[PDB]
Amino acid sequence: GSEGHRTLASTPALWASIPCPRSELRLDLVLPSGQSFRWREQSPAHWSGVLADQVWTLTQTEEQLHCTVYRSQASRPTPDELEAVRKYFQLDVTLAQLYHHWGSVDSHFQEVAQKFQGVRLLRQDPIECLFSFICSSNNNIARITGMVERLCQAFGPRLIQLDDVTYHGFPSLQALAGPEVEAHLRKLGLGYRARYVSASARAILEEQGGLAWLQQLRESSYEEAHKALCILPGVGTKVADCICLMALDKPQAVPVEVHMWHIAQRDYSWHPTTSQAKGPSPQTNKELGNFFRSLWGPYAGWAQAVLFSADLRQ
DNA sequence: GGTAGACCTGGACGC
DNA sequence: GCGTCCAGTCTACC
Ligand SMILES: Nc1nc2[nH]c(N)nc2c(=O)[nH]1
Numbered sequence: 073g074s075e076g077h078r079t080l081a082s083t084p085a086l087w088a089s090i091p092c093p094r095s096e097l098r099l100d101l102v103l104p105s106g107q108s109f110r111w112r113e114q115s116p117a118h119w120s121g122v123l124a125d126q127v128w129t130l131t132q133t134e135e136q137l138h139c140t141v142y143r144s145q146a147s148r149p150t151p152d153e154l155e156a157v158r159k160y161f162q163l164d165v166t167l168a169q170l171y172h173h174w175g176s177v178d179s180h181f182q183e184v185a186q187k188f189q190g191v192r193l194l195r196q197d198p199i200e201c202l203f204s205f206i207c208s209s210n211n212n213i214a215r216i217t218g219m220v221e222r223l224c225q226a227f228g229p230r231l232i233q234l235d236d237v238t239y240h241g242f243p244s245l246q247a248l249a250g251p252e253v254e255a256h257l258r259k260l261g262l263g264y265r266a267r268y269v270s271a272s273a274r275a276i277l278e279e280q281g282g283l284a285w286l287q288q289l290r291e292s293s294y295e296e297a298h299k300a301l302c303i304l305p306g307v308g309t310k311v312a313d314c315i316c317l318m319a320l321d322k323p324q325a326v327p328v329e330v331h332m333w334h335i336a337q338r339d340y341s342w343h344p345t346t347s348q349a350k351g352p353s354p355q356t357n358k359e360l361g362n363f364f365r366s367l368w369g370p371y372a373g374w375a376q377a378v379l380f381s382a383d384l385r386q
Numbered sequence: 387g388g389t390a391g392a393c394c395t396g397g398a399c400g401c
Numbered sequence: 402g403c404g405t406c407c408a409g410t411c412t413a414c415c
């Protein structure tokens with residue numbers, strides 16, 4: 073009862089609601105789609121993970137997003153804690169307005185959107201976003217998710233335990249920059265990205281000016297931000313775009329990799345024109361990104377998330 | 387200045 | 402059962 077992960081039905085008094093129609097958010101299409109790798113459906117329709125340094129379990133009904141938090145007497149989330157959730161999901165951005173616009177300028181989008189409503193972008197923490205996507209290159213979501221969990225258990229602050237799961241906060245720069253982190257990460261299976269993690273943590277702390285340097289990119293322009301990030305080891309144009317889009321508030325950033333290339337060719341009959349190559353390459357990848365921005369506009373990155381998410385399910 | 391490969395890891399097919 | 406695929410970044414080179 074008071075033990076293990078909660079369900080809306082098991083502990084009614086501990087949940088609080090946030091008005092949110094399924095049309096504005098579908099947890100099942102957002103949480104396991106490669107935006108964040110830290111949420112798990114521990115119980116059917118109930119997703120648990122760390123949000124704003126605390127463990128939460130989320131679940132939804134047709135018109136409500138139900139939330140519960142494990143912090144000391146167990147109690148429902150406060151209005152302020154709930155705002156933390158609203159902010160994580162950027163609920164002030166009306167998805168219905170965006171879907172309308174995209175669908176109006178892109179007939180293909182309209183068709184896909186009908187069956188994949190509620191795919192919005194999470195507003196993630198820069199550090200977590202940076203290192204999680206550093207682990208994402210030349211990799212699959214399943215493996216990435218494992219890698220990220222092991223990284224947090226080994227170097228992140230211990231939070232609370234539910235059932236046999238011990239939640240950890242994401243590691244700090246100081247921790248990832250520590251001595252012998254690379255070796256430990258290799259034993260955890262990060263492969264060659266183990267060095268990228270250690271090297272990038274040290275680079276930010278010892279060559280770029282610290283956490284402030286990263287957090288500052290939020291106020292900088294997409295072009296500036298994207299350029300700064302590519303300086304870090306293991307961070308190319310794609311990883312940088314993911315970080316810009318999901319943690320630095322650059323809604324126009326469009327991450328281009330295999331999935332978007334497939335979508336471009338199959339659903340838009342797209343082909344590079346200005347680029348030299350015919351297939352994927354730094355020149356053609358940049359061109360595709362421009363194509364999507366030209367098609368969808370200022371929130372092209374968000375539109376990308378809808379089709380990308382839909383392409384995973386497919 | 388724009389390519390070819392090599393690359394940790396492990397679930398997928400293909401046979 | 403097994404060998405080749407496959408889910409971006411970096412770096413020798415033409
Ligand atoms: N385009 C794109 N690539 C991704 N890779 C990972 N890991 N997540 C994403 C995503 O949301 N979009």
Ligand SMILES: [Ca+2]
Pocket residue numbers: 210330407
């Ligand atoms: Ca690939």
